[PDB]
């Protein structure tokens, strides 16, 4: 039975986007909590996003894995589109990078492993994320990741991304592919241990210069196996990044030495290492 706004008690504003509101809400019949993303119909029509919105609904409705934000339901009324989302109580990963500066090797290994597991599922369903970055990696109450923001995703272009995580093949060919998420994964891993993403500059253009050049440095304290793995992800040729299809996918990436002690079968059941 299709839900209705009156079925819920809306509580605190969790956040706002350019054209959205996300509020915490309790379903009255079940007492379940949801983050409900609310969209003004008018704004969406003034910018020709009716397909774009449907694609985000469709893509998220194919995601039933513990490391992605679940879409439980959608509904509408006269002015709004409503998206029933699982509630990620602890916010963006970016917040913890800023709070503690950078991760020790245990926390790096753990959260990287979860992202790898996430990408293995997403690419297994033929979906490119295209905007993977710590802003878009939420954390639930148990401190497990919850990847979100699927408006820009691609189901097996266009020009999307965030400058610091965009892959070279985007700025050179306008054609993203599964391997483009592995580039972003390379940048995220570097950001976890270094404290900053690897391609840094004053403005978007100079950042773009460094990516096509592969102009970046490792600091001396970078964990050696983490650096080795990044070097096998920050690779210009998108057919040569570890984990991509042309290198037989996620098996060889999950077998990299940085993940030696990882148990991939119950990562989502393990208690994450505390972030200090």
């Amino acid at each position: 039975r299709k839900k209705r706004p009156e079925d819920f008690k809306f509580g605190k504003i969790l956040g706002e986007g350019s054209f959205s509101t996300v509020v915490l809400a309790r379903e009255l019949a079940t007492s379940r909590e949801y983050a409900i993303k609310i969209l003004e119909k008018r704004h969406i029509i003034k910018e020709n996003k009716v397909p774009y919105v449907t694609r985000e609904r469709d893509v998220m409705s194919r995601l039933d894995h513990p490391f992605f934000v679940k879409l439980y339901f959608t509904f509408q009324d006269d002015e709004k589109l409503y998206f029933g989302l699982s509630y990620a109580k602890n916010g963006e990963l970016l917040k913890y990078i800023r709070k503690i500066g950078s991760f020790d090797e245990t926390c790096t290994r753990f959260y990287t492993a979860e992202i790898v597991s996430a990408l293995e599922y997403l690419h297994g369903k033929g979906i490119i994320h295209r905007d993977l970055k710590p802003e878009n990696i939420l954390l639930n109450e148990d401190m497990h990741i919850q990847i979100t923001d699927f408006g820009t995703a691609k189901v097996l272009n266009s020009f999307v991304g965030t400058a610091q995580y965009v892959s070279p093949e985007l700025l050179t060919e306008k054609s993203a592919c599964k391997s483009s998420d592995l580039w972003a994964l390379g940048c995220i891993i570097y950001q976890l241990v270094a404290g900053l993403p690897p391609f840094r500059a004053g403005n978007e253009g100079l950042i773009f210069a460094k990516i096509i050049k592969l102009e970046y440095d490792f600091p001396e304290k970078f964990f050696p196996k983490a650096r080795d793995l990044v070097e096998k992800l920050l690779v210009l040729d998108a057919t040569k990044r570890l984990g991509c299809e042309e290198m037989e996918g996620y098996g060889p990436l999950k077998a990299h030495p940085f993940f030696e002690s990882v148990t991939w079968e119950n990562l989502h059941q393990q208690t994450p290492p505390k972030l200090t």
Binding site: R1, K2, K3, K41, V50, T54, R57, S61, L71, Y72, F73, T74, F75, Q76, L81
Partner: peptide, 8 residues
């Protein structure tokens, strides 16, 4: 928005 509504 025709058949938007979805559950699940």
């Amino acid at each position: 928005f025709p058949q938007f509504s979805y559950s699940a």
